[PDB]
Design an enzyme around this catalytic site. Structure first.
Site, PDB file in Angstrom:
ATOM      1  N   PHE A 139      41.940  32.159  34.078  1.00 36.03           N
ATOM      2  CA  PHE A 139      42.938  32.978  34.873  1.00 36.03           C
ATOM      3  C   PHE A 139      42.630  33.303  36.274  1.00 36.03           C
ATOM      4  O   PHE A 139      43.311  34.031  36.844  1.00 36.03           O
ATOM      5  CB  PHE A 139      43.732  34.020  33.939  1.00 36.03           C
ATOM      6  N   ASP A 140      41.289  33.489  36.229  1.00 37.10           N
ATOM      7  CA  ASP A 140      40.592  33.909  37.613  1.00 37.10           C
ATOM      8  C   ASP A 140      39.170  33.393  37.956  1.00 37.10           C
ATOM      9  O   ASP A 140      38.673  33.095  36.940  1.00 37.10           O
ATOM     10  CB  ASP A 140      41.013  35.640  37.614  1.00 37.10           C
ATOM     11  N   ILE A 165      39.013  47.156  34.158  1.00 35.75           N
ATOM     12  CA  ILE A 165      39.233  47.258  32.857  1.00 35.75           C
ATOM     13  C   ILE A 165      37.699  47.879  32.260  1.00 35.75           C
ATOM     14  O   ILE A 165      36.586  47.681  32.817  1.00 35.75           O
ATOM     15  CB  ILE A 165      39.342  45.894  32.167  1.00 35.75           C
ATOM     16  N   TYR A 225      32.479  36.003  39.254  1.00 35.74           N
ATOM     17  CA  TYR A 225      33.072  36.050  37.762  1.00 35.74           C
ATOM     18  C   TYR A 225      34.326  34.806  37.538  1.00 35.74           C
ATOM     19  O   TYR A 225      34.745  34.399  38.754  1.00 35.74           O
ATOM     20  CB  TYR A 225      33.479  37.365  37.436  1.00 35.74           C
ATOM     21  N   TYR A 241      43.449  44.835  28.882  1.00 34.39           N
ATOM     22  CA  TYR A 241      44.822  45.060  29.154  1.00 34.39           C
ATOM     23  C   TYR A 241      45.948  45.274  28.169  1.00 34.39           C
ATOM     24  O   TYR A 241      47.048  45.853  28.297  1.00 34.39           O
ATOM     25  CB  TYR A 241      45.627  43.949  29.951  1.00 34.39           C
ATOM     26  N   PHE A 266      34.606  36.489  29.906  1.00 38.27           N
ATOM     27  CA  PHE A 266      34.284  36.599  31.491  1.00 38.27           C
ATOM     28  C   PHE A 266      32.905  35.810  31.246  1.00 38.27           C
ATOM     29  O   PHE A 266      32.049  36.423  30.383  1.00 38.27           O
ATOM     30  CB  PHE A 266      34.298  38.046  32.111  1.00 38.27           C
TER      31      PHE A 266
HETATM   32  C1  LIG Z   1      41.850  40.502  40.355  1.00 39.49           C
HETATM   33  C2  LIG Z   1      41.212  41.548  40.103  1.00 39.49           C
HETATM   34  C3  LIG Z   1      40.638  42.169  39.192  1.00 39.49           C
HETATM   35  C4  LIG Z   1      41.841  43.012  38.412  1.00 39.49           C
HETATM   36  N1  LIG Z   1      41.322  44.151  37.720  1.00 39.49           N
HETATM   37  C5  LIG Z   1      41.896  45.425  38.197  1.00 39.49           C
HETATM   38  C6  LIG Z   1      43.094  45.646  37.853  1.00 39.49           C
HETATM   39  O1  LIG Z   1      43.899  45.052  37.102  1.00 39.49           O
HETATM   40  O2  LIG Z   1      43.735  46.870  38.510  1.00 39.49           O
HETATM   41  C7  LIG Z   1      40.375  44.046  36.646  1.00 39.49           C
HETATM   42  O3  LIG Z   1      40.005  45.260  36.117  1.00 39.49           O
HETATM   43  C8  LIG Z   1      39.840  42.911  35.964  1.00 39.49           C
HETATM   44  C9  LIG Z   1      38.094  42.645  36.069  1.00 39.49           C
HETATM   45  C10 LIG Z   1      38.095  42.816  37.648  1.00 39.49           C
HETATM   46  C11 LIG Z   1      38.496  41.632  38.206  1.00 39.49           C
HETATM   47  C12 LIG Z   1      39.870  41.350  38.101  1.00 39.49           C
HETATM   48  N2  LIG Z   1      40.320  41.471  36.802  1.00 39.49           N
HETATM   49  S1  LIG Z   1      40.578  40.172  35.804  1.00 39.49           S
HETATM   50  O4  LIG Z   1      40.066  39.202  36.308  1.00 39.49           O
HETATM   51  O5  LIG Z   1      40.864  40.926  34.366  1.00 39.49           O
HETATM   52  C13 LIG Z   1      42.406  39.835  36.348  1.00 39.49           C
HETATM   53  C14 LIG Z   1      42.506  38.718  37.077  1.00 39.49           C
HETATM   54  C15 LIG Z   1      43.899  38.337  37.642  1.00 39.49           C
HETATM   55 CL1  LIG Z   1      44.115  37.040  38.507  1.00 39.49          CL
HETATM   56  C16 LIG Z   1      44.995  39.097  37.242  1.00 39.49           C
HETATM   57  C17 LIG Z   1      44.727  40.240  36.562  1.00 39.49           C
HETATM   58 CL2  LIG Z   1      46.110  41.308  36.002  1.00 39.49          CL
HETATM   59  C18 LIG Z   1      43.658  40.587  36.072  1.00 39.49           C
END
Ligand SMILES: C=C[C@H]1CN(CC(=O)O)C(=O)[C@@H]2CCC[C@H]1N2S(=O)(=O)c1cc(Cl)cc(Cl)c1
Length: 127
Positions: A55-56, A75, A45, A101, A118
């Site tokens: 951001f990711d 999420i 993703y 969030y 995403f």
């Molecule tokens: C970085 C890993 C996950 C983080 N989480 C889990 C959590 O925040 O406890 C997520 O639920 C979501 C969806 C899965 C992938 C990641 N995001 S994210 O991309 O929304 C995300 C990325 C980053 Cl770099 C920071 C944060 Cl806070 C959230």
């Protein structure tokens, strides 16, 4: 761009029909089966904020992101959206903050009240 397109042209995949999670299938996956609750799911993703910042990205890490579906390990928009995907599918998801969030955000990267975009590829899912 792609975030605008899923905002204007995406499918509401929520049970509430509140437009909190919108989806476009970009690449059609295999057959009809979708993962079930508890399955180990393997995704690639990328995530963008509504100011255009990435951001990711899992591709940038050279490793998929792995979670158990439908357990609140991610999420809500992901537990809802990944559950609709076929193996090999790529989709776009637009996630309002109530399915992400919220007013809290997630310091440092996610502001308060953030709508997230995403692109997700479902690589595999295993019982
Ligand atoms: C970085 C890993 C996950 C983080 N989480 C889990 C959590 O925040 O406890 C997520 O639920 C979501 C969806 C899965 C992938 C990641 N995001 S994210 O991309 O929304 C995300 C990325 C980053 Cl770099 C920071 C944060 Cl806070 C959230």
């Amino acid at each position: 761009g792609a975030p605008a397109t899923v905002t204007e042209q995406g499918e509401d995949i929520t049970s509430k029909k509140d437009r909190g999670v919108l989806k476009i299938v970009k690449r059609v996956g295999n057959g009809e089966e979708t993962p079930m609750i508890g399955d180990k799911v393997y995704v690639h993703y990328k995530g963008k904020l509504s100011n255009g910042k990435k951001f990711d990205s899992s591709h940038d890490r050279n490793e998929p992101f792995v979670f158990s579906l439908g357990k609140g390990q991610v999420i809500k928009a992901w537990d809802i959206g990944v559950a609709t995907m076929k193996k090999g599918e790529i989709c776009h998801l637009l996630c309002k903050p109530e399915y992400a969030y919220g007013s809290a955000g997630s310091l440092p990267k996610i502001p308060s009240n953030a709508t997230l975009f995403f692109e997700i590829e479902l690589l595999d899912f295993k019982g």
